[PDB]
Design a protein around this ligand. Sequence first.
Ligand SMILES: Cc1ncc(COP(=O)(O)O)c(/C=N/[C@@H]2[C@H](O)[C@@H](O)[C@@H](OP(=O)(O)OP(=O)(O)OC[C@H]3O[C@@H](n4cc(C)c(=O)[nH]c4=O)C[C@@H]3O)O[C@@H]2C)c1O
Ligand SMILES: Cc1ncc(COP(=O)(O)O)c(/C=N/[C@@H]2[C@H](O)[C@@H](O)[C@@H](OP(=O)(O)OP(=O)(O)OC[C@H]3O[C@@H](n4cc(C)c(=O)[nH]c4=O)C[C@@H]3O)O[C@@H]2C)c1O
Lengths: 370, 370
Amino acid sequence: HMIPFNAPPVVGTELDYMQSAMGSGKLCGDGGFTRRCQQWLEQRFGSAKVLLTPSCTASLEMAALLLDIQPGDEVIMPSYTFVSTANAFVLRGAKIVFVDVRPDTMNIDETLIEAAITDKTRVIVPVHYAGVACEMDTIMALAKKHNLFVVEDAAQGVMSTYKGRALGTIGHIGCFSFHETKNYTAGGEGGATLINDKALIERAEIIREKGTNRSQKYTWRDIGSSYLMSDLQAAYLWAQLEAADRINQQRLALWQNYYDALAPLAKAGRIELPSIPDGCVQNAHMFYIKLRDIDDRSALINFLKEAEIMAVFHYIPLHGCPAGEHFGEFHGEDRYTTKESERLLRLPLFYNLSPVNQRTVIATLLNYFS
Amino acid sequence: HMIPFNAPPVVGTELDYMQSAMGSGKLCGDGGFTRRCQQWLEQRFGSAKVLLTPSCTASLEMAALLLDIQPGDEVIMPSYTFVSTANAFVLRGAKIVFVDVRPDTMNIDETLIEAAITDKTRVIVPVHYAGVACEMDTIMALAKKHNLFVVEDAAQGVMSTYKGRALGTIGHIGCFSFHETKNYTAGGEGGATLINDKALIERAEIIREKGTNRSQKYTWRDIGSSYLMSDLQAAYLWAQLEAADRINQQRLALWQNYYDALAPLAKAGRIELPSIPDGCVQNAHMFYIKLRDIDDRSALINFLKEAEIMAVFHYIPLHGCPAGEHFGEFHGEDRYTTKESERLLRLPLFYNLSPVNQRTVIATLLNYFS
Ligand SMILES: Cc1ncc(COP(=O)(O)O)c(/C=N/[C@@H]2[C@H](O)[C@@H](O)[C@@H](OP(=O)(O)OP(=O)(O)OC[C@H]3O[C@@H](n4cc(C)c(=O)[nH]c4=O)C[C@@H]3O)O[C@@H]2C)c1O
Ligand SMILES: Cc1ncc(COP(=O)(O)O)c(/C=N/[C@@H]2[C@H](O)[C@@H](O)[C@@H](OP(=O)(O)OP(=O)(O)OC[C@H]3O[C@@H](n4cc(C)c(=O)[nH]c4=O)C[C@@H]3O)O[C@@H]2C)c1O
């Protein structure tokens, strides 16, 4: 019926690898395919240790756990992000300090961060929105200056780079998602924790396995959780990593079709297209546009629904939310976060999106704008 | 080469159900197979709300979250259990209070619980060891008298009952595991939270969905996590639930082979076999035997290894573990927990264990004992 906003990536090989996993008699976490995926991720992206988890949320929770977040500790992050980015730390008793976005990338504004730092700050968590890297050199410098840890929420950033560097690998800890909505999926749910700070590796491994030294009599040695994805899901993921470049190249092609078709409307000021800072290489996770305001956006959404095409808005700013006024505080003026969140619209974009269907989406779009 | 202690259940239909899930274009949590599994569990076992999670550990954590565990709260549980039963509550700041097991079932001794209660106590979490029920009528009466929640750790108990009631459906909250070592697996990892106290359902659903509302704009409404298993895993589990009785019956037959073969050695006092209290219906999750002591057990373990047969001990008592001395306290005397844990040996038992290999195992056992 409808052209969907998203469909999980399907390469065609997942079933064979999964079959193989089932044949091996090991399906729980940390099996052969889990290990191969971690190896793949470690070597290709350049991280000392990668650990596959049930979700990026779990990886984020794990980072907070690793960094020993205490009640009262302050964690700086955008208000324009997914709930999990905040919950992971609130779960540890953190106070969330929100910082406004830069409107060009919808990323945390690296220039507004230092002003929000206090003697209580212990972590900053940049979010690489749409797989477009935050201004990390600046952010890493600030963090060295104020003795802060950096946890990358690189959920959307698998295959993206910043100045040649793989996203998720530039901070003490990085986090990936393999949710069905991402560029790569582990059978529908999944994440990875990237432990880039070598000093944290020992404990990371222990808390991943329920606080035991299972990777080694094993016994209760620390807090932890079951931060393992099934090896069945890892087999699925392994199939997709085998096609990492094929998927990425196709998504980028689709992304550029959108850009080429909508560029004239942008040069006329009717809309805005995404910005990709110099030195940042994206992975085409998302193609968003900015309408004039929420009414403009709502009208387009309805026009597209009439055309059996599903387009979608994204984050509701966390700080304005019930839990957000309670668990956090917005530092400075909300100049862009709420406004920009209300004009941002995401277009159908996924690996298996047919050329004919993308043309349909595009023709319908060019129709709305006149 | 070796006859293993365990192999994940393979029914033969899992591939087809998973193909269907992949064919549907929905693989993330809370898709069709997740809903069907929850329906099956709710109706067959009689629980108001069942929610599939990435692990029993996740379910235990969710339970701790639901019950609003605060730092200083005391939670009573056996020391003879898996680390997660404790970690889930320690994560919330609970102090763990350990109570000795009754040796016949290795379950928490229901008569030793009240002596451990203080004004700080808020939860007791009985563990149904080997899928054999704790003395639940007594424990629930006890908990009602003192206004305590009961969280069942029923990880090993899918298909077991207590006086006609499905294990996991009795306490305010129950927890299942669908890990590869269990009787039913969701592709290697998985769990379920059973919300039997209807009053907890509303919040349960919100916590489960990253602290948001799925009346489906949605927004940040509470703390929570990503307590979703992928629908791919749910498809696998659904296949296994379709063969729930066949699997259970096959395990029970294998179990009885062990009991029948080893009974004479037990009547001679050389070993002890498991006890199943009246009113308890087990699910043949495990067949353990008790040797005279740890040296006897090690000798038998090595003898079997020689025979290319893998037999295995189980929990190391949490109260004696590094983390356990720090996060918890053993109330009273350790009369049975440590002693009994050291003579207990678990025998190869899994759905796809061939009769010929079981005969080999039994024969090797009868050989060791003379
Ligand atoms: C930085 C960051 N950190 C962490 C994680 C977590 O990773 P893990 O899951 O692996 O643990 C993520 C991933 N989030 C993705 C999607 O980006 C997210 O949008 C949402 O996707 P959905 O399943 O809901 O479907 P959809 O088509 O993306 O939208 C469907 C409708 O929901 C409306 N909506 C949406 C949002 C977001 C919101 O706030 N408020 C809101 O009303 C818009 C639509 O009409 O959930 C996913 C996991 C992340 O980006
Ligand atoms: C009440 C309860 N609550 C919660 C949960 C968690 O649920 P989820 O996983 O679903 O999230 C569980 C599940 N536990 C099972 C198994 O019961 C458990 O044995 C263990 O199994 P393994 O994967 O490790 O393999 P194995 O063959 O069972 O043993 C392997 C060797 O390790 C040695 N060993 C073992 C233990 C236990 C220990 O402490 N110390 C130790 O040195 C014994 C062997 O030689 O872990 C599983 C998840 C549970 O029972």
